[PDB]
Amino acid sequence: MTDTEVAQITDNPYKADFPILAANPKVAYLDSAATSQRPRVVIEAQSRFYETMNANLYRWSVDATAAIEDARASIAKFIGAVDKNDKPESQQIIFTRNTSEALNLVASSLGRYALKPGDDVVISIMEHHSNIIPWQQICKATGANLVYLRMNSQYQITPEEIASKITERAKIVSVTHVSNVLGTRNDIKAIAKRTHAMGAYMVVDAAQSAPHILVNVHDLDCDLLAFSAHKMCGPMGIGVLWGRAELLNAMPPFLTGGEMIDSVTETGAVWAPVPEKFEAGTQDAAGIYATGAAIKYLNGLDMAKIEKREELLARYLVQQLCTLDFVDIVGSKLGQNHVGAVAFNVRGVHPHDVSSILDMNNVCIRAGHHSAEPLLIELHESSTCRASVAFYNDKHDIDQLIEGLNQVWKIFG
Amino acid sequence: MTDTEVAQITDNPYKADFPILAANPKVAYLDSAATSQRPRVVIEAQSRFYETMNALYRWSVDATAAIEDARASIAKFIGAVDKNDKPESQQIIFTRNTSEALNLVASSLGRYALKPGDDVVISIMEHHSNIIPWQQICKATGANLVYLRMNSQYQITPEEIASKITERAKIVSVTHVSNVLGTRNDIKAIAKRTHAMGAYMVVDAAQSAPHILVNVHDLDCDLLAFSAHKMCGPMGIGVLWGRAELLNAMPPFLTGGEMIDSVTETGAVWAPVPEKFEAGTQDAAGIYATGAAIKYLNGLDMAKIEKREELLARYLVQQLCTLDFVDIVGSKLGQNHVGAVAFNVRGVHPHDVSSILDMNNVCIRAGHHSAEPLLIELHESSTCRASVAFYNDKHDIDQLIEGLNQVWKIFG
Ligand SMILES: *Cc1c(COP(=O)(O)O)cnc(C)c1O
Ligand SMILES: *Cc1c(COP(=O)(O)O)cnc(C)c1O
Known part of the structure; x- marks a missing residue:
């Protein structure tokens, strides 16, 4: 140096x-890999939401709605989820509690949607537990096989290992963007290319890359991507799942109940559009607001x-x-x-x-x-x-x- | 008056x-039935957590102690105390809201208990989050969704209770207080018939926990859920209480980090309750502020x-x-x-x-x-x-x- x-x-x-x-x-x-410290502006933004616009058609609820939507747009822009006009694709941003829940949502919804017995779910040996066990569970339930990408002596997933493990049987591939132990940066775009050539979906655990390196869902060619706000100077309790718009409409809902419906009868229900289809009950509006404040802070830096x-x-x-x-x-x-x-x-x-x-x-x-x-x-x-x-x-x-x-x-x- | x-x-x-x-x-x-406004002390507690103990080092030990104190406060608030009046903190599970807790119960208790032909009994008063998870688990297990109906005075009569909760009932889940009618249902009486039928009693206490005395031992419920944001707490925090033996028997809901005891490439051994049901990083600051809301409510x-x-x-x-x-x-x-x-x-x-x-x-x-x-x-x-x-x-x-x-x- x-x-x-x-x-x-x-x-x-x-x-x-x-x-x-x-x-x-x-x-x-x-110990930033576990959770971030909070910028002052992120802390005051959360308190400011509760003091000035706390609401779940009156003025407070209208402001809270606008504060949420602006936060979705800021998050979408941060990960490059913008359309051909640079308009942020805010309707492909789904809020969770953390990366763990987002990965549970994906494994349950995408697994039910796509997995047939004999299919392959490919993850890496570097995976966080939240990108392992939901796959253990859904593989046993659908008759799919859980396949592991291994490393070489330099803690890397080689192109040969990518092509050896991601075969025609692959249906879902879920790989961490950056390892939370080794710090290895995995070539997500290259893994996506092989994944798609085999007709499989690409899921990215970006919990350790979103706080540190450029994330662009379009340049990465991923179908789903998840991360946690508390690891990038946001508040705890907020996770983000981005999804390809067509894939989120095909995927069945995860949690069901209020606010994810369009109509309900005694015996059935009609789902709301994306992203509301995937957000059940009262959301953490103040935490979402503070996450948008974190994005604006990181943008300004x-x-x-x-x-x-x-x-x-x-x-x-x-x-x-x-x-x-x-x-x-x-x-x-x-x-x-x-x-x-x-x-x-x-x-x-x-x-x-x-x-x-x-x-x-x-x-x-x-x-x-x-x-x-x-x-x-x-x-x-x-x-x-x-x-x-x-x-x-x-x-x-x-x-x-x-x-x-x-x-x-x-x-x- | x-x-x-x-x-x-x-x-x-x-x-x-x-x-x-x-x-x-x-x-x-x-519109407090939608969500409460926040007392000053609740907002400051959330800011205070992030400014002073945001996290085996000192800050993590403090955050761990702050979280456990909040569980204890919540358990004592709903009367979940042992025979020495010590709060049963290990029976308090944190979710995002009542909706997620009811999804957890329907998925975990349904898989544990529902057999084809069994009855799941809810009431016509139910919030959507106490309806659709039951529609979903019933379609998957072969169970039937049965509805407790009202009389002309918007009440669930003892006759209707005995009529709808029959020998085929396995899970009964009823709101304590209607979020539209304001009707207070006789949860203790429903649980009596529920348990005589060999069924489990689930309580949606989202509209009762902020207004009336909730005592899980006097209500005889097996599982109870509510949301902190409807009782002067922050948003993003839900609470599920359950009988200790029942929570051990129930399979996990979300899987991943923090809810395990060990993991291999092909399997995993679950952590004990309540950690078994809490996957990933929890909203420790919101948990802390929820305890401050309990302390605020206790003072009033x-x-x-x-x-x-x-x-x-x-x-x-x-x-x-x-x-x-x-x-x-x-x-x-x-x-x-x-x-x-x-x-x-x-x-x-x-x-x-x-x-x-x-x-x-x-x-x-x-x-x-x-x-x-x-x-x-x-x-x-x-x-x-x-x-x-x-x-x-x-x-x-x-x-x-x-x-x-x-x-x-x-x-x-
Ligand atoms: C508000 C409400 C719910 C759902 O609460 P959330 O915090 O939105 O998940 C459940 N039951 C009743 C009676 C309610 O009023
Ligand atoms: C932290 C971590 C997770 C889990 O994040 P939570 O916010 O605790 O759910 C998942 N993947 C990686 C790589 C992580 O570092």
């Missing part, structure tokens, strides 16, 4: 936007500027972890091959000990399986530490982790 | 706790809240009855309304009534109120609905009555 690159991450022009970070200047929060800073932070994190001979990185030792997350272990020390000591030094990391236990079994690991970076981190935060790990070794080495 | 009762609802010792009402003194919000005393809202409902029905051009959809006795009063201005579409009322800063709901099978039973296509909460007052209701006269002047 050059003198200038290190200088760029020594400066921190973003940390002050976050009240919890400004109020706790000694704390080095390196420039995602290209965010990505550039987060590549440098990731490289500095991997580079500085590599100077500790008692640290084994779980993944690539090349920082540029890490988006966000860097998994590692202090040799012979359980991650629970590493994390407990690091918190005594005001360092927040994640320890355990990281909801990717099949991946860890593949790599012969019971548990790992995981440090993750966001644009509001800086060089000092990483140095504080490195100094904290020397204190871990001094105690457990 | 006595002279003191009118003076009681004339004074309003609560609405100043709600920033949107204090900032808009001219607005008469009578439900017995005081119910007593005030009973007076407001009586005044609303009494005043609506003074208009010859208003037809109440439901009982004409105000004490038979919990919260909600549905009505129609003769010959005027509810959309017209609501448009004019908004010009007069009156907020009501117009349409089907997500209870279309009920309106079809009552030969209505659409109605207005005004609803009362403790932070309403006599002025709000009078403003509605005056606005209704402006409606008749324009469309009568």
Whole structure:
């Protein structure tokens, strides 16, 4: 890393936007892969909704409706879901609680729609649990087979592995865009091309890519894409599912009840149009509003500027972890091959000990399986530490982790 | 109504706790049956969580402790306490809303208990979220969807209860309070017949939890669901309570992270209840603010809240009855309304009534109120609905009555 690159991450022009970070200047929060800290403008936007337009034809409900629709449009534009006139395709944005529910919705609705016995559902060994178990469940129910894309020695899914596992039997392919443990960026567009050539649907878990890299559903050629707002400076409780307009109309509803209907009788019901077809009951309008505020915040900061800073932070994190001979990185030792997350272990020390000591030094990391236990079994690991970076981190935060790990070794080495 | 009762609802010792009402003194919000307004302390608790403990490090331990305190508060609020009065926090499951909890129950309890030929019994009063999940699970299991009907006084009689809940019944799911009629159903009595038939009792408490005392042990229900946003909590938080043995027997609903104990490539071992039913990152801040709403409601005393809202409902029905051009959809006795009063201005579409009322800063709901099978039973296509909460007052209701006269002047 050059003198200038290190200088760029020594400066921190973003940390002050976050009240919890400004109020706790000694704390080095390196667990953004789990959830983000909240920008002040996102917190006040949620409180502002509840104070000024809280409603579920009167004026408050009309404003709340307009605030929701503007948030759908902002989210659609953020992931490139725009029509030929750049008009955002807001009606292809479906709100959930998190990525987990969106993937449950997809596996249930798309699985019932498309899966026949003998079909193949292809996922990767890097998948988060929420992109595994809904497929275990629906495969057993439809008679379909669950197929796994494996990695090579460099934690990558090769084109040969893509063509070897995605065969004619494939009906659904659901792959994470970025691994929440390895930080590998998977070639989603290339996987989609093979997936479509075999007549299958492409689902993308973008929970770890939406906060860090450019997401464009049209350039990615995916049929469905899901992510969580709380991982990109939005509030908790809001997940997003984008869907190809024709596919969402064919897909059957997931949750049923109020607000997803057009009419109901004692014995049947007629479904509402998309996206209302997939949103049952009272939605979190304030959380949706605050998510739109998060998009406007990220837009104003420039995602290209965010990505550039987060590549440098990731490289500095991997580079500085590599100077500790008692640290084994779980993944690539090349920082540029890490988006966000860097998994590692202090040799012979359980991650629970590493994390407990690091918190005594005001360092927040994640320890355990990281909801990717099949991946860890593949790599012969019971548990790992995981440090993750966001644009509001800086060089000092990483140095504080490195100094904290020397204190871990001094105690457990 | 006595002279003191009118003076009681004339004074309003609560609405100043709600920033949107204090900032808009001219607005008469009578749509609390759709959603509550937020007390200041509930809004600040949500902001406070994100500013102070948003997350084995300190912030995560604090957020874990804050979430568990909220479960305990919610369980004690609905009387879910053990034999030592300790709240049964592990029987509280968080959803987005009542709708998702009812979808969870219908899917998980239906798969666990429904056999072909079994009866699922609901009532004609049900909200759509307590209808369609039963339509769906019945079509899949070969069960029958049976309806408890009303008498001429909008009540479910003991005779109808015994007639419809028969030996073939496996699941009974009835609303505690109608979101259109305001009728309070005898949930304890329905559960008695339900359990004698060897069936499970499910309660939609979305319209009762904010108004009347809910005690899961006195109601004898097996599962109960409600929404926090209808009881001064934030949106996005729903609550499902269940008997501990029943929640263990019930299969998971959503699957994925956080609800497991271990995972392999081909299978998974589930976490214990309630984590078994909570997949992925939960809305910890909304959970925290929901506990703050419980603390706020506890400080006001439900017995005081119910007593005030009973007076407001009586005044609303009494005043609506003074208009010859208003037809109440439901009982004409105000004490038979919990919260909600549905009505129609003769010959005027509810959309017209609501448009004019908004010009007069009156907020009501117009349409089907997500209870279309009920309106079809009552030969209505659409109605207005005004609803009362403790932070309403006599002025709000009078403003509605005056606005209704402006409606008749324009469309009568
Ligand atoms: C509002 C309502 C529901 C649904 O509540 P949501 O929060 O919208 O899911 C269920 N039952 C009754 C009686 C209701 O009034
Ligand atoms: C965090 C994560 C999920 C689950 O996200 P939730 O918001 O907790 O539902 C899914 N996939 C990946 C890659 C993740 O990192």
